[PDB]
Amino acid sequence: TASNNDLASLFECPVCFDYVLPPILQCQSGHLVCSNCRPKLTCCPTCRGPLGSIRNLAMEKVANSVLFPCKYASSGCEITLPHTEKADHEELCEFRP
Amino acid sequence: TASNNDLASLFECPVCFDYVLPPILQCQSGHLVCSNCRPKLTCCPTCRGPLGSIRNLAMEKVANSVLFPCKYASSGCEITLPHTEKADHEELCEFRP
Ligand SMILES: [Zn+2]
Ligand SMILES: [Zn+2]
Ligand SMILES: [Zn+2]
Ligand SMILES: [Zn+2]
Ligand SMILES: [Zn+2]
Ligand SMILES: [Zn+2]
């Protein structure tokens, strides 16, 4: 059936391909942007509609069921983490630059 | 970790407690209502904001990873179904009235 990596990929930011973690915002048509890309943009990167601040509460609840890969996976980190632990892990991760 | 019934419950309509299936709409603040309850309402049953028609595309994608219980589970149906098969199953289900 369904897998954790299948669910996690639904949170990928279409701009940086890191993960969109709570709080999760979206445009009128349902496109996501992460917290870090959002301030560098004047509109939705997918549809060019306004970014806005519609709240995707349901996706935040899904996120409590997903283990998200460390942002340093491409440097060789194999740890996957609940979203509440991801930031603290990445700050001390063996594979950070 | 996470379970299928945990994910499925995130789709429960807060009005009838059946499941909100694609296409999934939501209010400004992220509350869901199913296709059948929506026309019987003049505003979001959770926050009383406008119902609107913001599209929760991400939840629709999650839904492709979830097996949803037959609406006649409380009559004793134990079948759980991909959302694309749920309606046809319920039309012939052993446990319909
Ligand atoms: Zn991003
Ligand atoms: Zn958009
Ligand atoms: Zn790491
Ligand atoms: Zn309903
Ligand atoms: Zn609402
Ligand atoms: Zn059934």
Sketch out chain A's domains with CATH numbers: 1-65 (3.30.40.10), 67-97 (3.30.40.10)
B57–A30 CB contact, under 8 Å: yes
B56–A55 CB contact, under 8 Å: no
Question: What are the angstrom distances between the C-alpha of B78 and each of B57, B74, B89, B90?
Answer: 28, 9, 12, 12
Of B24, B29, B62, the CB nearest to A10: B62
- DSSP, collapsed to helix, strand or coil, labels residue B6 as helix
For Cα atoms B72, B75, B76, give the angle at the middle one, nearest 5 degrees.
95
Give the distance from CA B56 to its chain's centroid: 13
Task: In whole angstroms, give the CA distance from residue A25 to residue A13.
Answer: 11
Q: Locate A87 and state its tokens.
A: 């930031």
Task: Write down the experimental method used for this entry.
Answer: X-ray
CA-based nearest residue in chain A for residue B32: A58
Q: Locate B96 and state its tokens.
A: 């319909």
Q: Locate B13 and state its tokens.
A: 């309509």
In this structure, what are the phi and psi dihedrals at residue B62, rounded to the nearest 5 degrees?
A: -55, -40
- Burial of B14 per CB tally in 10 Å (0-12, 13-18, 19+): middle
